[PDB]
Amino acid sequence: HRPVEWVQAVVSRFDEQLPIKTGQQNTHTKVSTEHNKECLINISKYKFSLVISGLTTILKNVNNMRIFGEAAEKNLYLSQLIILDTLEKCLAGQPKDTMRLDETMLVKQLLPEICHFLHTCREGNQHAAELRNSASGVL
Amino acid sequence: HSLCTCSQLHFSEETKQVLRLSLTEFSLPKFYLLFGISKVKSAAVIAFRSSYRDRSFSPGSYERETFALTSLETVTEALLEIMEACMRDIPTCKWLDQWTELAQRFAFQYNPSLQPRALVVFGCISKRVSHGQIKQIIRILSKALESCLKGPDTYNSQVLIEATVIALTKLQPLLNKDSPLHKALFWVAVAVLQLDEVNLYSAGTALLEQNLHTLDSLRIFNDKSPEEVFMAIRNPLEWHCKQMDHFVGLNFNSNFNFALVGHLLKGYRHPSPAIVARTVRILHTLLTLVNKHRNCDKFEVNTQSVAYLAALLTVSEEVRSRCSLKHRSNVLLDEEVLTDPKIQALLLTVLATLVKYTTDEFDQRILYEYLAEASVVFPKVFPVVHNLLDSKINTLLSLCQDPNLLNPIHGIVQSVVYHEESPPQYQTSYLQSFGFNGLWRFAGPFSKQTQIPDYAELIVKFLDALIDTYLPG
Numbered sequence: 030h031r032p033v034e035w036v037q038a039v040v041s042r043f044d045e046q047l048p049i050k051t052g053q054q055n056t057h058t059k060v061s062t063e064h065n066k067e068c069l070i071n072i073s074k075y076k077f078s079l080v081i082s083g084l085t086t087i088l089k090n091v092n093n094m095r096i097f098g099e100a101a102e103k104n105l106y107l108s109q110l111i112i113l114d115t116l117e118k119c120l121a122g123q124p125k126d127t128m129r130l131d132e133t134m135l136v137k138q139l140l141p142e143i144c145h146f147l148h149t150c151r152e153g154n155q156h157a158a159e160l161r162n163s164a165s166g167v168l
Numbered sequence: 169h170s171l172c173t174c175s176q177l178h179f180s181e182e183t184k185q186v187l188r189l190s191l192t193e194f195s196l197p198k199f200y201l202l203f204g205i206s207k208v209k210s211a212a213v214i215a216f217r218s219s220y221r222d223r224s225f226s227p228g229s230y231e232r233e234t235f236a237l238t239s240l241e242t243v244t245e246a247l248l249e250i251m252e253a254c255m256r257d258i259p260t261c262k263w264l265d266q267w268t269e270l271a272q273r274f275a276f277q278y279n280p281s282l283q284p285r286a287l288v289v290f291g292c293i294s295k296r297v298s299h300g301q302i303k304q305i306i307r308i309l310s311k312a313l314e315s316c317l318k319g320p321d322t323y324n325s326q327v328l329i330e331a332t333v334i335a336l337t338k339l340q341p342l343l344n345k346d347s348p349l350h351k352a353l354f355w356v357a358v359a360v361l362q363l364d365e366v367n368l369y370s371a372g373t374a375l376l377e378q379n380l381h382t383l384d385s386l387r388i389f390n391d392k393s394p395e396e397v398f399m400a401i402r403n404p405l406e407w408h409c410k411q412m413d414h415f416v417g418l419n420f421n422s423n424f425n426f427a428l429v430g431h432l433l434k435g436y437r438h439p440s441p442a443i444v445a446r447t448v449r450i451l452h453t454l455l456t457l458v459n460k461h462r463n464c465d466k467f468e469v470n471t472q473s474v475a476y477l478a479a480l481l482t483v484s485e486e487v488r489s490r491c492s493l494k495h496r497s498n499v500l501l502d503e504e505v506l507t508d509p510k511i512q513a514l515l516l517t518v519l520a521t522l523v524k525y526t527t528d529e530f531d532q533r534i535l536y537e538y539l540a541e542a543s544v545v546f547p548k549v550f551p552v553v554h555n556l557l558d559s560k561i562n563t564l565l566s567l568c569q570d571p572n573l574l575n576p577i578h579g580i581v582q583s584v585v586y587h588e589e590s591p592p593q594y595q596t597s598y599l600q601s602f603g604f605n606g607l608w609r610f611a612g613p614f615s616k617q618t619q620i621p622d623y624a625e626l627i628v629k630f631l632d633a634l635i636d637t638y639l640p641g
Contacts, residue, residue, distance in 0.1 A: 031554045032584045038565040039581070057569040064571065068578045075585045 036076060039069055040083045047111065048104040049091065066115060073119040078131070080119065085138040088112050092142060106156045113163045120167070143168055171254065179257050186253040190246070202239050236367075237288050237331055244292045268294055276304050280324060283308075284331035291338035302339070302349060303639045306356070308332050310631045316620050326365070326618075333360060333371040340375075341382050348638045350386070351401045354379055355409075355634070359627050361431045362416055366614050370443050373435065377446060380453050393461040393472075394454065395424040404637050408630045415623045417606015425458070425475040426514050426604070433479060433518075433611045437525065451479050467491070469500055471511050478518045481538070482531050493541050500538070501545050513549050513598060514607070516542055520556035521608045529573065536576040543583035550584070552598050556608055 044050060046062040056062050073080040091108055146164040150157040171177070172187050179187075193199065200206050208214055217225065255261040271293065274286035287305070309332040315325045336353065343350060357379060360372040383389060388397060399420065402409055413419050413427075420427045435447025455476040459466045462473075467490045469477065477500065480487045491500040506512045519542070523535045539557075543550050561577060568574050599605055 031558045032581070032588060035562065035565070035581050035584070038562055042566055055569070060571055061569045061574065064574055064578065068581065071578075071582055072585060075588075 033079075036072060036079065037083075039065060039072065040080065040087075043069060044087055047091070047108045049094070049096070049101075049108040069115065070118050070122055074123060077119070077123055077126075077128075078134070081116075081131075082134055082138065084112065084116055084119075085134065085142065088116075088142050089138075092145065102153075106153065106160075109160065110163065113160075113167055117163070117167045171250075177254070177258060179254065183253050183257055187250065190250055193246070199243075202243055204233055204235065237284060237327065237334060240285060240288050241292055241334070244289050248293055264293065264295075276308075280328070284327045287331040287335045291335040294339065295342070297339045297342050299347070299349075299639060302336075302343070303635055305332055305335055305339070306631065306635060306639075309356075310628055310635075313620075313624055313628050313631075317622065317624060322619065326368070329360075330367050330371050333368070333375055337371070337375045337378060340378065345386055348401065350383065351388075351397060352634060352638055354398050355402065356631070358428075358431065359412075359630065361434070362412075362621075362627070363624065364615060364621055365618050366438060366440075369434065369438065369614070370440065373443065373446050373450065377450055377453075380450070380457075389457050389460075394428075394457055395472075399424060405630070405633045408626070408633050412623075412626050412630060413603070415626070417604065417609060419603030422603045423510075423514065425472055426518075426607075428454070429475045429479055429518070430604075430607050430610055433521065434614075436522075437611070437613045439614075448480070448483055451476050452484075455480070467497075469498060469502060470505055471508070474500075474506070474511070474515060475518065478515060478522075482522065482526075482534055488534070493537055495541055501541060503545055509549060509594070510602065512546055513552055513594070514604065516546070516549065516553045517556070517599065517604070517607055520553045521611050524556055524560060524608070525612065529570075533573055533576075536573070536580070540576045540579040540583070543580055543587075547583070547587040548593055550587075551592055552594050552596055555596055 042062075042065055045053070046055060046065070069080065088109070091105065091112070094105070096102070096105060143164055146157075146160050147168070150160065169191065171179075172184060172191070197206075200208065200211075205211060205214070251263055251267075255263060268290075271286055271290045274282050275290040277283070287308075309329060312325050312329045312332065316322050316329075333356075336356070340350070340353060353375070357372050357376040360368055360375075363369075383397075402420075409420075413421075418427045418430050429451075432447050432450060436444060438444055438447075455473065456466055458473050458476070459468060462468070462470065464470065464473070467487070469491065477487055477491060481491075481500075490497050493499060493501075506515070516539075519535055519539055523532060523539075526532060526535070539553075557580075561580070564573070564577055565581075568577070597605075599607065
């Protein structure tokens, strides 16, 4: 009962450290927010479905966000980079459970957001180059 | 001063030195506070007024300090030191025997303004006490409690209780060496801690601390264990005792040591930093007595001697070093001896309770490391400690920014999920089944709305039965 609500706290704090989200200087030199990642990666091994589903919504919100300015674009580029890198480690980190019953998430939640990056994505000459490399590894 | 400069009396040169030291002491800033004239540079100036013939005095600042019967002991014992010094020279003196009679008349007579002060003095000076006297003192405490709940004026009669307890703290070491009450005054101390007031709690420990000290000098714990002594004398009046345990939320038949520790853990929440160190001493003295019964080096871990080690974990360095967490001598939490589901459910509730109210970086660090290791070594019983940890952990995860304090918390979350996905073997209400449903509640802070918890209607009956059984008449 309680522990399910404990995981939400670890996930919820993850969003509040995204550059695009107000920093608030909660990074504490990034050591505090970096520890959160390691726990989030570890938790995925036993709550893979829950953690993955939460991550997709976090990515979906970032995609459906309009911001203007040189700083704004730079923040969003670095923002999406962190989500993908964390997401890939969970998939690779997860043992070979070979559970093939994730169809629900894959068909709608996850694939459409990953597929978007694979498009030409001519918004950034240097940014799109890295995103495809990172996104491709996820797929 | 008049004593030092009197010719009728012939004080030897030794005594006159005692008085002169007392003459200087009373003029120290320590005693200006005891008399209640702190913030006054000199007493002489205030006592007299120059224009005392022309105009009448003009009092003001009606705001008036309070008085604490603990101050009266310090003064009442300074004077008694002076008087005895004189009696050594003066042959066949009657000073002390006349003073006692004056106190003994107001002590046992109803006067709500003088009785409390005449009990703190009757005990501080008296040199002999009889069984008939003790019953009167213990029956003034029974009448004091009944008045508190009936009427709305409490503070008036909440100082006649603290005065009855302070008297007993001084009159016990004079009782006969073979009286039952030498042991039956351990339940008065326990029955007073349950009233949830800082002053009553403070006086309750002072009676308990010397109750152990006195019994040692009589060599009563030589061949028996605390549980054996106090629980053997409670048997004749077990019916009344049982009913109290039901409501307070602790049980003494199921587990003595833990029930006793439950009361003492509240000491850590006392505003005065002097009562905090007194409850630590009472733990050491109890630890050295249970182990001595088993001849276990004074730091071994067993079922009996594990409760007092969790309380000393965060205050005693020697306990931390001699009992270290395995996942950095012997290591606490050994599963070889702690192989009973009950004896390991309580030891976790003690640790959870100590952190729910604690507010200190150094304390929270040490206690969480012992809870992470508990998650793995005791996977099955750990789910009975969620509600205690539920609220505070949730906050720490969100806002904590300390790597040292954030590491152990994460280890706990990982362990919970790992051993999840199984039907709960032990529910959260596992403790209420066998008595200890109130252990975490009894260690809270002292309530600002000081009032008798209203289950004191049973403490009256218990005390009344105690008199009938051990002081028939």
